[model samples]
Target: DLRPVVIDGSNVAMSHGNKEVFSCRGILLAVNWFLERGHTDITVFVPSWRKEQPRPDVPITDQHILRELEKKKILVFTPSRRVGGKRVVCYDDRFIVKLAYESDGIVVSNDTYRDLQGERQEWKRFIEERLLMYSFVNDKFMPPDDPLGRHGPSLDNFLRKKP
Candidate 1:
C-alpha cells in the first residue's frame, strides 16, 4: 500500500510554479517529487486561478489532463468562487489540513501551516509527522532539514520502513 500525499498546490504554484510567467510544469515537477517514489496517490490543492496557468497546448482542463495527465494518476482541486470581480485567492490552507487530516496523508510545501495547527491537537501531530517541506537547490528538489530532529521524511526511507 502507498501512503497518500497532498500538495499545497498554490504554495507550490507560488514557489516553483510561477516566476515572471506561470508554468504548469512546476506542478508536474512537484508531483514527480513524490510520484517517483511510493506516493502515487497524490492530490493537489489550489485556487481557481490555476485555470490561468498557461498551458498553451491544452485548455488546462485537469478540472478544466493538462490538469489531469502529464502528472499521471493524480487528482487536483482548483476551487473557484468570485466576489465583486475581485481576484479571490481564498487561501484554503484549512482545507489542505482537513483533507490531510482525514486521509492521514503527507502534505508537501514550503508553508508552515501555523493557523491550521492551532485548532485541533490531532491536527498538530499529523501535520508534524506528515508535513514535508521542500525547497529547490540549483533548481533541483530538496527536502527540509528534518522537522523532528531525527530521521527526515525521505520517500526512499519511508518506503523501506513500511514493510
Candidate 2:
C-alpha cells in the first residue's frame, strides 16, 4: 500500500533543485550511511524547489544520481506545499521525524548540526554518538573545467571595514 510520505529538501538539494547532481550525491551518501547501520526501507524527500516546473529536458531531469539510488533500493519521494505560502522550498526534519515514527521508521538528518549549532557540547556529543546512525564521506562536486570562475571575496571581508 502507498504510505504517507513526509518530504524535506534542505538536506537533499539545498533550497534549489538545479544542483541535483551534487545534492543527489549528498543524499546517496546519507542514505548509504544509514543503511550501513542495518536500517532499510528509507525514503528521501525532495522539496518543491526541486520540482520540475513546466518540465525539463530528458537527461538533465532524469538525473543520473537519482537513477543510481533507485538501483540501491532507496525510495525517493517529493512533496510540495499544496497551499500558498511565502517561504522557501524547505521543511524541517521534526515534521519528517513525526511521519517516520508513525510509519515505523526513523528519520535521519543533520538537524543535530542545525539545532545545536552553538549550544552545549553535551547535546552535540549526544547526537554525534547516538542520533547519527550513518557515516559517509563525500567531497564537494563541481563542474569540470567550467569557466564561470569562483566566488571571490571572503565573508570576513564583508564584515571588516576598509582600513
Clashing residue pair totals per candidate (backbone < 3 A):
4, 0
| Candidate 1 least-lDDT 10 residues | 57-66
Candidate 2 residue lDDT tens string, 1-163: 2222222334544312444433455565555544554545566754434444423331133345565664665644444554465334434554455455456433344355555524556444433432322223344322122111245223222112221
Per-residue lDDT of model 1, residues 1-163, tens digit only:
7667777766665565334334455666777777777566778776655655445642332333235642454645556665897556665787788887787767777787877778787888877777777775434666665534465655444433263
Backbone clash pairs in model 1 (N, Cα, C under 3 Å; residues 3+ apart or in different chains), count:
4
In TM-score terms, which candidate is top?
1
Question: Residue 26 in candidate 1 has what lDDT?
Answer: 61
TM-score of each: 0.73, 0.42
Best by lDDT: 1
What is the Å distance of residue 18 in model 1 from its true position? 6.4
Predicted structure 1, TM vs. truth: 0.73
Q: C-alpha displacement of 62 in model 2, angstroms?
A: 9.4
